[PDB]
Specification:
By secondary structure, this protein is an alpha+beta fold. It is built from eleven helices and seven strands. The structure holds calcium ion (CA) and chloride ion. Keywords: Calcium, Metal-binding.
């Protein structure tokens, strides 16, 4: 099998970590070794696997391949997988909040990218009064412009992404075509402002739970910026 027991345990735990049981299983591991080697190596593997999912790979395949590669070493220390130095990208998948968590403890404060299309937004503008108020403000019949920003609870769409981002600020930018009737169409795009990730584990207590938050309170962290590049084209109409 593997050249070491850390990789062996990773492969054994694949069915649980690459599932909805990931958090509970990781909490149990962290409790067992006091956020020790196996826990740190698991967390780094999650971040690596998420990175690979962001690049187009299958999560479980990516996870298994990283564990297998760790398995080529006879060593068992926490550096048998290194948190890489370059451009980290969040996939929006199962392991994304773990990747963000990993980044606060291993990423040296470097910015991370969360492509807007990976977040899982499904913004219903008609459900946002401050935006609808601006839409339906003093406008000429014909074409006019809209460019406004609004807070958004990402949990409206993805409890998961929420674990990483919480609230963010979105920008709606485009043009409105309106009738002499008062019927209108908006065509444009949603963009997102950068989000500060506060890597203090007390900010993550609800998700991480009592024991893990306690264990991580002892570990150094550096907060960082999450860049949320790109645009989501959208169309909205009303009266
Ligand atoms: Ca936020
Ligand atoms: Cl070793």
């Amino acid at each position: 099998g593997m050249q070491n027991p850390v990789a062996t345990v990773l492969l054994l735990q694949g069915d649980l970590y690459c599932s909805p049981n990931c958090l509970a299983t990781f909490q149990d591991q962290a409790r067992r070794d006091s956020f020790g080697i196996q826990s740190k190596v698991a967390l780094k593997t999650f971040a690596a696997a998420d990175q690979r999912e962001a690049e187009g790979r299958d999560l479980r395949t990516a996870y298994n391949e990283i564990a297998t590669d760790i398995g080529r070493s006879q060593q068992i220390n926490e550096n048998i997988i290194k948190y890489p130095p370059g451009n980290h990208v969040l996939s929006g998948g199962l392991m994304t909040p773990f990747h963000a968590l990993a980044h606060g403890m291993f990423g040296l404060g470097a910015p991370l990218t969360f492509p807007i299309q990976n977040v899982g937004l499904n913004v219903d503008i008609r459900g946002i009064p401050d935006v609808m108020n601006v839409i339906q403000s003093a406008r000429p019949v014909g074409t006019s412009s809209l460019d406004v920003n609004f807070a958004y609870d990402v949990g409206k769409d993805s409890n998961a992404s929420w674990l990483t981002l919480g609230n963010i600020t979105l920008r709606l930018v485009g043009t409105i075509d309106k009738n002499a009737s008062g019927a209108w169409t908006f065509s444009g795009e949603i963009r997102a402002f950068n989000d500060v990730y506060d890597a203090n584990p007390s900010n993550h207590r609800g998700w991480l739970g009592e024991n893990l938050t306690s264990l991580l309170s002892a570990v150094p962290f550096t907060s960082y910026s999450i860049e949320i590049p790109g645009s989501l084209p959208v169309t909205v109409s009303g009266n």
